[PDB]
Write a protein that binds this ligand. Structure first.
Ligand SMILES: [Cu+2]
Ligand SMILES: [Cu+2]
Ligand SMILES: [Cu+2]
Ligand SMILES: [Cu+2]
Ligand SMILES: [Cu+2]
Ligand SMILES: [Cu+2]
Ligand SMILES: [Cu+2]
Ligand SMILES: [Cu+2]
Lengths: 128, 128, 128, 128
């Protein structure tokens, strides 16, 4: 099974996917985030952040509240299972995490914590 | 508030969204389903079907079993709150339903009953 | 004095207060519960339930055992002094009760009976 | 004789069967429980629990009262002859037990201890 996915965020505050599957045979999984937009990180930043569905709102709220210099993530936020850095136009960033950190049955969500994010700038992550 | 949404189904057996919001002040709500793919209805049919989250399994199971000639919906399925017809490439169909059929605190799902739909070929419909 | 308080429950199974005061000059008192989270009632429900400290465990235990269809409250539970209904993301519910139901010297607790509730998902209610 | 059975729980709080037969020549018997529903364990959990018909009431009452974190079973319940873990959508669990635990002339029941179970959410297990 493939153990990596390629995700893009654009100038419209949109990922080009709303659902990621992670095969349970993968020991590590890698998300390759890129930004094919024109706008710089300060005005149109994207990151890819993973948490349980219950923690998502808190991660996003405290993250926006932390500011750009903190990558819009609260420091030492244990709710964050994995994340990329925040990136602007023409940048890329990959995160590899251990799939064992995921549990069968639990509900996981991926999302971006740059302020202005819509209710749909998020997605499901599911084991298969 | 707006009381309609445009949904597209594609040639990879997907919807372009997995989350629809229905403003609570809407008396009626309209889903505009379109099929911009190239594949005909008998190989890549899409419908948009709404039920409670708990009823989705039964609607999907009985519907897929009812055949192309019934639009893959069990006849007289009272669990189906609203639905479009099954469409192929270049077809469109709209459904309008009364928002009083939705109840606060209840969870609702939209999905597709054409055989072969993955577990991810569905979404949440939520009152806001 | 004021005879109302505004309480919020989130996606972390948390209230935003652990202590409510009720002025003895209030003839009625109103709890305004809201759910600013993103998660639906079936996975992340909240209610606000009031009982003596001694009855709380039994209310909670028999409530969880009653299931979601009964709002996680045992029917005809005479230990329940006052309660809101169970609510999910985007919902609100208010309960007004007669302050005369409270007696000086007695210890009262407020809490939530949705399962998974931690031993901190409660709070004191005190006359002043 | 075959010494195993496949059992499904669904999103309507039901098993697919209400009657299991265990051939008396079986030395071990295996129950393969699965959850083809869409709803998670905290909203639509299923377990398969075996006891005498007389012990069913106590196991259910004590179990449902024991909470999601104990899989809705009283700790160290000597009445439980065999059980699967509690599973949600997409999960599966198997239990194998010694048939010498069953005695001729006794009556046995299987059931589920997830709160909200109906009186029909159960079945007979019979030596044959
Ligand atoms: Cu592989
Ligand atoms: Cu973003
Ligand atoms: Cu309007
Ligand atoms: Cu479809
Ligand atoms: Cu006053
Ligand atoms: Cu609560
Ligand atoms: Cu045999
Ligand atoms: Cu069950």
């Amino acid at each position: 099974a493939e153990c990596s996915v390629d995700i893009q965020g654009n100038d419209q505050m949109q990922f080009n996917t709303n659902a990621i599957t992670v095969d349970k045979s993968c020991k590590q999984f890698t998300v390759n985030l890129s930004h094919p937009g024109n706008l710089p990180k300060n005005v149109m930043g994207h990151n890819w952040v993973l948490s349980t569905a219950a923690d998502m709102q808190g991660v996003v709220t405290d993250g926006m509240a932390s500011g750009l210099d903190k990558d819009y993530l609260k420091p030492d936020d244990s709710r964050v299972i994995a994340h990329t850095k925040l990136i602007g136009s023409g940048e890329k960033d990959s995160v590899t995490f251990d799939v064992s950190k995921l549990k069968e049955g639990e509900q996981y969500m991926f999302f971006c914590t740059f302020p202005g994010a819509s209710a749909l700038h998020k997605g499901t992550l599911t084991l298969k």
